[PDB]
Ligand SMILES: *[C@@H]1O[C@H](CO)[C@@H](O[C@@H]2O[C@H](CO)[C@@H](O)[C@H](O)[C@H]2NC(C)=O)[C@H](O)[C@H]1NC(C)=O
Ligand SMILES: *[C@@H]1O[C@H](CO)[C@@H](O[C@@H]2O[C@H](CO)[C@@H](O)[C@H](O)[C@H]2NC(C)=O)[C@H](O)[C@H]1NC(C)=O
Ligand SMILES: [Cu+2]
Ligand SMILES: [Cu+2]
């Protein structure tokens with residue numbers, strides 16, 4: 312069952328074996344992935360998170376981010392540790408009480424403390440639209456049509472060297488899959504469809520690192536949503552999905568009744584499908600209960616290309632139709648050396664006092680904010696452009712901005728900008744050497760918003776900055792509850808920190 316929009320959520324440690332190998336984990340709702348949190352557009356969500364963690368090897372503190380939800384007027388509920396809150400300590404709970412006006416689509420939730428989400432705290436978050444403009448394109452849209460793609464590690468995250476190229480041990484599709492080494496024939500996930508019906512498949516990358524080449528043998532996929540943003544229909548036979556991205560696609564169950572492989576090939580770790588790695592099963596009602604015998608093509612003739620996507624609504628692009636044509640045009644210098652990433656020459660290391668609390672206590676320019684050089688102020692009611700030129704090691708880097716979605720004016724692997732009708736989204740691959748992926752948005756949401764690579768190992772190694780949007784209005788726009796004000800005193804007392 313789905314839970315929400317008002318629900319408790321317990322965070323616990325438990326052993327799990329999603330690929331046949333047992334290890335301890337950090338779980339929401341006792342499962343991997345966690346339960347789907349759901350509601351309708353405009354609803355009040357009140358997710359009371361109970362931190363019941365006791366195993367220090369995966370951290371006993373926690374904090375949860377609601378990925379892609381704008382949090383307008385509720386910056387304190389966004390979740391990134393040391394940006395918008397101190398962590399919740401064990402044996403305590405915290406009500407994330409916010410609203411989702413003007414958003415409907417496919418999201419997710421995850422730990423936003425250190426690399427803790429890798430250890431298991433990740434699940435889907437769906438905001439349905441009772442008047443969805445795409446409703447007539449499918450028959451079925453429910454918990455059975457959500458498809459999660461996850462990387463899974465045998466080594467615990469806090470034992471991964473910082474700045475290292477860290478590689479997974481299994482791909483999990485809906486929580487199940489087979490290990491790349493010592494492969495055992497452990498259970499594969501089954502997605503069941505009825506011949507003749509059309510399904511809204513909600514494809515969610517809950518990855519900590521790899522991107523996946525996703526396809527379904529014999530089937531094609533009609534994209535209708537990108538990171539929460541409704542799209543024009545685009546039919547493809549393969550989707551390359553980067554960490555934290557989401558797509559909805561229509562699956563027409565129009566092939567002969569049978570079993571078909573679902574494939575998710577990561578860019579690192581095990582290559583291919585030997586032993587049923589990187590695989591799940593699409594089963595038609597009435598098919599024999601057996602593994603598929605289908606083949607992938609050698610090459611995919613209609614892969615997703617990001618410039619082919621366009622919004623369903625007339626969203627346009629803010630600003631003027633040329634590079635630098637914005638009120639506040641930025642170019643970030645994105646680099647890596649010696650195990651650490653930097654942005655504009657500064658490697659991100661989380662501050663002792665969360666950025667939001669520094670601002671509520673009176674610090675009101677970005678040079679007064681800690682970490683020094685890691686906070687850039689943005690002016691209010693202004694068009695912002697951010698160029699993100701690639702080349703830093705460990706690519707392709709999927710950059711994500713909190714508090715906002717953005718027009719993708721220039722995409723990976725294509726030097727031509729689009730100032731007319733690009734897709735809007737919240738997480739974007741910045742591509743390869745020489746690319747100049749560029750995003751635009753308007754600043755109508757006061758508060759400190761994290762900008763970072765969503766490969767969690769890279770974030771841990773410093774690949775982040777904070778946009779302090781409209782510092783002067785942050786306090787009036789974001790009144791804080793007493794329970795939020797209590798978090799830093801409790802955390803600092805528990806950890807013997809003076810501040
Ligand atoms: C990416 O595009 C940005 C503009 O959005 C380029 O920025 C210019 O960089 C040069 C130096 O390289 C400066 O003289 C300008 O002030 C910058 N802003 C402009 C022209 O609007 C940046 O060079 C591009 N990077 C790559 C790798 O192509
Ligand atoms: C490279 O990106 C550009 C810009 O998004 C794409 O150019 C558009 O192509 C569409 C489809 O033919 C035309 O309707 C638009 O007028 C083009 N816009 C511009 C500004 O040129 C281009 O198709 C992409 N290249 C590839 C190989 O997909
Ligand atoms: Cu996220
Ligand atoms: Cu986010």
Ligand SMILES: [Cu+2]
Nearest residue numbers: 708764766769
């Ligand atoms: Cu990265």
Ligand SMILES: [Cu+2]
Nearest residue numbers: 391713761763
């Ligand atoms: Cu983040």
Ligand code: NA
Nearest residue numbers: 627628629630
């Ligand atoms: Na415009």
